[PDB]
């Protein structure tokens, strides 16, 4: 009923590992690499890169400004996945949960990045988040290019 998913996958072409240690690690650069949709993120909880730091996002999406506070809520070195819960912000107005999973696929030639989303909506009439997505992907981008 309320509960939905949805699943992108989108080849990158620099370093797999590199990006990956950015979502774990330097989550903190994602503003000097994609500027027009991250404006600023803090660390508010524990350390960079650990299962349940705590990290203050300031974003915009289509133009208007958002915030989201969120808890990094898994973390899997194996399959180069970090999962993301979102507790705070602009989302839990449409949405009753949301949890975001970041996976890279390293290994070969060509590698990947797969987003998905695990939500469940306040009411039926709120909207599956694709422009979300479309952020997300958009992001991926900037980040594949930055310095190319």
Same mark, same amino acid.
């Given at each position: 009923?309320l509960?939905g998913?949805?699943?992108?996958?989108v080849?990158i072409?620099?370093? @797999?590992?590199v990006? =990956?240690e950015?979502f774990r =690690?330097?989550?903190?650069?994602?503003?000097?690499?994609?500027?027009?949709?991250?404006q600023?993120?803090?660390?508010?909880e524990g350390?960079? @890169? !650990? &299962?349940g730091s &705590?990290?203050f996002?300031?974003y !915009?999406?289509?133009?208007?400004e958002?915030t989201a506070?969120?808890?990094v809520e898994?973390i899997d070195?194996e399959?180069?996945? &970090?999962?993301?819960?979102?507790?705070?912000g602009?989302?839990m107005?449409l =949405?009753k !949960?949301?949890?975001?999973?970041?996976? &890279?696929?390293?290994? @070969?030639?060509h590698?990947?990045?797969?987003? !998905?989303?695990? =939500?469940?909506?306040?009411?039926?009439?709120?909207?599956?988040?694709?422009?979300?997505m479309?952020?997300?992907?958009?992001?991926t981008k900037?980040?594949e290019?930055?310095?190319?």
């Amino acid at each position: 009923d309320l509960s939905g998913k949805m699943v992108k996958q989108v080849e990158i072409l620099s370093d @797999g590992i590199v990006f =990956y240690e950015i979502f774990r =690690y330097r989550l903190y650069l994602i503003s000097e690499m994609s500027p027009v949709n991250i404006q600023g993120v803090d660390l508010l909880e524990g350390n960079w @890169g !650990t &299962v349940g730091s &705590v990290i203050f996002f300031k974003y !915009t999406i289509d133009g208007k400004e958002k915030t989201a506070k969120d808890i990094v809520e898994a973390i899997d070195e194996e399959t180069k996945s &970090v999962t993301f819960k979102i507790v705070e912000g602009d989302l839990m107005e449409l =949405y009753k !949960t949301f949890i975001i999973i970041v996976q &890279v696929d390293t290994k @070969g030639e060509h590698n990947s990045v797969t987003w !998905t989303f695990h =939500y469940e909506k306040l009411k039926e009439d709120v909207e599956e988040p694709n422009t979300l997505m479309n952020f997300c992907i958009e992001i991926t981008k900037d980040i594949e290019t930055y310095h190319l």
